[PDB]
């Protein structure tokens, strides 16, 4: 049983090229937007599992308060 690649069908049918020309919906898509609001933009920066397990639920604006949380976090 040879590992050599052999193809039974070498060419695309002519009828199937005609079909590709007439319908390309499966190779086209909708526009994938970036975050459209300042909220959704912070959420993208600050979301994800890593970012979520490394920050308080109630946001802390001063790094003096934030270490108090972060300090309890990396140990195990």
């Amino acid at each position: 049983k040879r590992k050599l690649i052999v193809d039974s069908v070498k060419e695309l049918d002519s009828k199937t090229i005609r079909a590709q020309l007439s319908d390309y919906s499966d190779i086209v898509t909708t526009l994938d937007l970036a975050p459209p609001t300042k909220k959704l933009m912070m959420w993208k920066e600050t979301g994800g599992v890593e970012k979520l397990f490394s920050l308080p639920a109630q946001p802390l604006w001063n790094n003096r308060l934030l270490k108090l949380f972060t300090r309890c976090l990396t140990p195990l």
């Binding site: 070498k10 695309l12 090229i17 526009l31 937007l33 970036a34 933009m41 993208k44 308060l65 300090r71």
Partner: protein, 903 residues
């Protein structure tokens, strides 16, 4: 020989061709054989074609024998291998074919031997079902053809020159017959070359551009693009373009790109073609739709092509076409956004710059896909760098005087984005991927221009717009981008004082949350104590707070006396003032004001009276949270502040717990996240660094532990749309942090693990991390809770005992069970799991008999796969302690047990 010389060594390419041409002259036959074998061996074939074969066998029969004698290890062949040394190979292969023809184009190529031989072999090989031959030969034939197009082109030129010589003499003997003779010889030569070109095109190209294998299709379309760009007068007509047209609809991205690269080549750098424009007009629809191709790499090249099209003519592109491309400026993917931004520039962007700035603001306002400019700005950053860093210009349109106020806001927005992206040197989130010399310089240059410009303009700006919340929230973010030294050395302290005054005036006339947050966050930036400026600002801070605290006590007098039941109005008075205090206590120390009293007095009074407007509760809660937290920071250091802290802390946890059941839903959420925060903060981990803090440690009751679980089950696991989600994931991770840091008993995770399937898109990622973080913590009690998960799913379906084995509920629990096994000291865990599964299966007895829980072993059967050959005995020994003889014998409803027993 040859195959070796090409990849292995890197002697010049023309040196090996000439040696081959040498040999062809000594002996045509041995040298053409060396060339046949060269193509065979480039395919990976280890066969050899011998002289006897060459002399006597047809290609078809040689190709068959060379399939037989191939001697392959894998399905690998040279053009599909990876690495630089094969990339170097593929190019040396193609270079040799080109350089061979070009060095034969005057004599050898027009014998009747060499090319007809090479072409027939490449044509036969390209017809092979063997891919290594079909793929390799097509490349060879496709290169060969490109080499041949050059010869034709040269020939065409030599004809035109030689004809110009002929006419010069007709005008003026015996040189005439010679020029006629030459012109004739050359026409004979173009004939042999069209034939060879048609052999390759009709024998290989026409079949292979359409090969089943996409990598072969891409080869073909690439070279036909090269033919049309190289000898346009002969190849740039529909009868070669149509292929590229059809292939744009190919189902593979790799092939689709090559159609666009090919076309780009017929506009850039140079063109003016009426045959091309006709085609493009036929296929424009299909091209603009490829701006949203599924493959992003393909979508860039479609926009870049639509840009090149634009240059030659604005004719083809309609309104709606261009509008579609504009939309891609707000795309998640930066390379498409930048290419659309480049299109947008050329299309609509022809003091000086002011008209260009009004244009961007209009563009931003007309497009309804984004409500902030951050992504619009970044798309344009590359091609409009100069127009975006013109802050003096933009600054002048908001001040010196028309502009509708909608337009003044959008320009304020845009302006800020430009600045932040100039100041921080990364793109906005999701556009990123650092940082070179000349970038650090432009950065430094950019901050200073900014700081200097906006130290003076910003106070005038707040003044002008200070009554509008969107605008001020935006403006207030500017100082965070300044180099602050420039306030002292620039001798700008009069402006700094002016700024603070506007901020103070703003803090006091505003009650919007986002305004007060900007204010607070901005005062934090300006109170940095690596800067001479600190003391000036610290005083400014201290004075604004004095006013806020003092007004807060007075409101809290009339508000909390018994006689006056305060209405909706008296309340907002307090709320308005409290918000400003809460906003500031977050970012600023504020210890000097013991306002725990005022907040406490306001939370406990909500409890007893049961009527306190939510917004007041929420901010009270938040505020006292920061009060506690700031005290925990200054700990040089006393023990009467330390024992008092513990008081407030212990008491605040009791309030948050009462409010957790408060009928008001957003209040629950507020009290829940604060709690999850403090529980983590004052956990046993508090002392990990120091031990001074052992009295503060707080462990929650089993009562509080369940209530936090009650909340999660009621509020995270239920039957703008993106808003409600991100909130919920936030509450979920808050509780899970308590789990993976064992602030809460690991058993609680049972009611959360069971949901990994039922909420796999909303909460999937969070739940998986909770499972890993508990594998890494305690592989064993992880596995315990993992089964208790399935146990809970099982007892639930009972109330919906037995039975439907063929149920959708039950089939789903087995589904979840199959997935908890792949997750699996490394074997004492699965040991522990089968033990508890078996213990649970026989928990309750039947009363004519199977025990009620007996179906659980079809679930438990999902884990017997994972471990283990010696352990299966020890498991079965443990099973026997539960199962009886009269049980191992019954084969009737008892199927789960008979099932589990295999393994």
């Amino acid at each position: 020989m040859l195959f070796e010389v090409v990849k292995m060594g890197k002697s010049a390419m023309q040196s090996v061709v000439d040696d081959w041409i040498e040999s062809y002259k000594h002996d045509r036959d041995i040298a053409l054989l060396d060339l046949i074998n060269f193509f065979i061996q480039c395919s990976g074939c280890k066969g050899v074609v011998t002289a006897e074969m060459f002399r006597h066998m047809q290609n078809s029969e040689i190709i068959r024998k060379m399939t037989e004698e191939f001697d392959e290890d894998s399905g690998d062949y040279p053009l599909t291998m990876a690495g630089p040394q094969w990339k170097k190979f593929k190019s040396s292969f193609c270079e040799f074919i080109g350089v061979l023809v070009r060095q034969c184009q005057y004599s050898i190529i027009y014998d009747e031997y060499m090319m007809d031989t090479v072409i027939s072999l490449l044509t036969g090989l390209s017809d092979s079902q063997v891919r290594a031959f079909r793929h390799t030969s097509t490349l060879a034939a496709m290169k060969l053809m490109t080499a041949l197009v050059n010869v034709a082109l040269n020939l065409s030129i030599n004809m035109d020159n030689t004809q110009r010589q002929y006419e010069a003499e007709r005008n003026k003997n015996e040189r005439l017959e010679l020029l006629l003779q030459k012109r004739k010889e050359l026409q004979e030569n173009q004939d042999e070359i069209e034939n060879m070109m048609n052999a390759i095109f009709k024998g290989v190209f026409v079949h292979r551009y359409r090969d089943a294998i996409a990598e072969i299709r891409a080869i073909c379309i690439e070279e036909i693009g090269i033919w049309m760009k190289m000898y346009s007068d002969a190849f740039l007509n529909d009868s070669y373009l149509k292929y590229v047209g059809w292939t744009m609809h190919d189902k593979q991205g790799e092939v689709r790109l090559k159609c666009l690269t090919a076309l780009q080549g017929l506009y850039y750098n140079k063109e003016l073609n009426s045959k091309l424009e006709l085609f493009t007009s036929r296929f424009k629809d299909r091209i603009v739709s490829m701006t949203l191709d599924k493959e992003y790499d393909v979508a860039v090249q479609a926009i870049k092509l639509l840009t090149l099209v634009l240059q030659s003519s604005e004719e083809v592109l309609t309104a709606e076409d261009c509008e579609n491309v504009y939309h891609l400026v707000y795309s998640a993917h930066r390379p498409v956004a930048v290419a659309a931004g480049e299109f947008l520039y050329k299309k609509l962007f022809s003091g000086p710059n002011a008209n260009l700035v009004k244009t961007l603001v209009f563009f931003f306002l007309e497009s309804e896909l984004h409500e902030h400019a951050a992504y619009l700005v970044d798309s344009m950053w590359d091609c409009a760098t100069e127009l975006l860093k013109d802050w003096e210009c933009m600054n002048s349109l908001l001040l010196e005087e028309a502009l509708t106020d909608r337009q003044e806001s959008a320009l304020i927005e845009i302006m800020l984005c430009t600045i932040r992206q100039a100041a921080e040197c990364h793109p906005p989130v999701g556009r990123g991927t650092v940082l070179t010399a000349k970038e650090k310089k432009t950065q430094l240059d950019d901050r200073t221009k900014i700081t200097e410009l906006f130290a003076v303009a910003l106070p005038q700006l707040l003044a002008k717009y200070s009554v509008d919340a969107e605008k001020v929230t935006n403006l207030l973010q500017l100082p965070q981008y300044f180099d602050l030294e420039i306030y002292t050395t620039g001798r700008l302290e009069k402006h700094l004082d002016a700024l603070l005054r506007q901020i103070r005036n703003i803090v006091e006339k505003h009650t919007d949350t986002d305004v007060l947050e900007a204010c607070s966050k901005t005062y934090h930036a300006l109170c940095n104590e690596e800067f001479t400026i600190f003391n000036r600002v610290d005083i400014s801070r201290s004075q604004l707070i004095d006013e806020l605290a003092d007004k807060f006590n007075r409101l809290l007098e009339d508000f909390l006396q018994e006689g006056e039941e305060p209405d909706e109005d008296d309340a907002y008075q307090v709320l308005s003032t409290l918000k400003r205090i809460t906003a500031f206590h977050n970012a600023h120390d504020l210890s000097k004001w013991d306002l725990f009293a005022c907040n406490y007095k306001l939370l406990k009074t909500g409890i007893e009276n049961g009527d306190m407007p939510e917004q007041i509760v929420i901010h009270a809660l938040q505020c006292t949270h920061y009060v506690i937290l700031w005290q925990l920071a200054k700990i040089s250091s006393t023990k009467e502040d330390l024992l008092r802290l513990k008081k407030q802390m212990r008491v605040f946890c009791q309030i948050c717990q009462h409010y957790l059941t408060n009928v008001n839903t957003t209040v629950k959420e507020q009290a829940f996240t604060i709690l999850c925060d403090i529980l983590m903060i004052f956990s046993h981990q508090i002392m990990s660094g120091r031990d001074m803090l052992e009295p503060l440690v707080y462990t929650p009751d089993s009562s509080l532990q369940s209530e936090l679980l009650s909340f999660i089950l009621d509020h995270v696991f239920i039957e703008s749309k993106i808003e409600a989600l991100h909130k919920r994931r936030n509450l979920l991770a808050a509780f899970c942090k308590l789990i993976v840091y064992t602030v809460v008993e690991m058993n609680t995770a049972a009611d959360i693990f069971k949901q990994y399937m039922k909420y796999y898109n909303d909460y999937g990622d969070i739940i998986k991390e909770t499972m890993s973080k508990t594998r890494q913590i305690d592989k064993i009690q992880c596995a315990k809770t993992l089964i208790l998960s399935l146990q809970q799913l099982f007892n639930e379906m009972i109330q919906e005992y037995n039975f439907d084995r063929s149920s959708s509920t039950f089939s789903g629990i087995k589904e979840l069970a199959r997935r908890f096994a792949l997750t699996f000291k490394t074997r004492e865990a699965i040991a522990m799991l089968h033990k508890d599964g078996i213990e649970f299966a026989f928990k309750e007895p039947n009363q004519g008999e199977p025990p009620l829980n007996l179906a659980f072993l079809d679930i438990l059967s999902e884990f017997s796969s994972k471990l283990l050959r010696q352990d299966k005995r020890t498991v079965y020994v443990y099973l026997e302690k539960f199962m009886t003889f009269q049980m191992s014998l019954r084969r009737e409803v008892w199927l789960p047990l008979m099932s589990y027993r295999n393994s």
